[PDB]
């Protein structure tokens, strides 16, 4: 999954 601050 994407890191907490990604996207």
């Amino acid at each position, epitope marked *: *999954d*994407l*890191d*907490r*601050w*990604a996207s």
Partner: antibody
Amino acid sequence: RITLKESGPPLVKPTQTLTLTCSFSGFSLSDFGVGVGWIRQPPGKALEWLAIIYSDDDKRYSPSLNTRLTITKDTSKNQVVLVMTRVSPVDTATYFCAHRRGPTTLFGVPIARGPVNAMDVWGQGITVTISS
Amino acid sequence: ALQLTQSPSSLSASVGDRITITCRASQGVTSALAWYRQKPGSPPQLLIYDASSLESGVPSRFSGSGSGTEFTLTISTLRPEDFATYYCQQLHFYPHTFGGGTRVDVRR
């Protein structure tokens, strides 16, 4: 000034449970978006990421160790605990906890996420040997 | 999972040299990449965060560039304290992977 320090048993026997504590000062795990993670380093080897926990209490674990790790925080004591079950000899390593910044805010408004991309302050590390 | 490959794994150099270490990711990690220097017996120390930002208190000879799948750390004028092992870390995808490390030692 942020400082972290790891504590726990230096020696542990196979199949046993290992509980490591990270006590820190200079920040609160109630501060916005802050994280505290754990990384280990077997002697002579590379760094290996284990887990991290944020102040809003989201938790994430290494997929390879997921079943044996539990990370938890105690905000009022400024501590983060990592519990590893069923250890075996390959778990002998130096274990480090580390701080991760949350986004910069301006008048309590998140404006920069670049500072979250690193673990910026590390504890000295605690050496753990697993042997019967 | 995501793979982070450092090159070279080992590198020899002398005080005053310019060295550059590179780290390649198997999938794009945007700019979420950090570089660390770890001296024997000590914890890793943050040099560069977010691919290119210089961490506060870190000497200016250290520089980081790149985004996506290819990153580089260059130390422009190697000092004695730089003989050490360097690591890159990706923070875009969980788990937050580390590269294999690159050892920088005294050339002879």
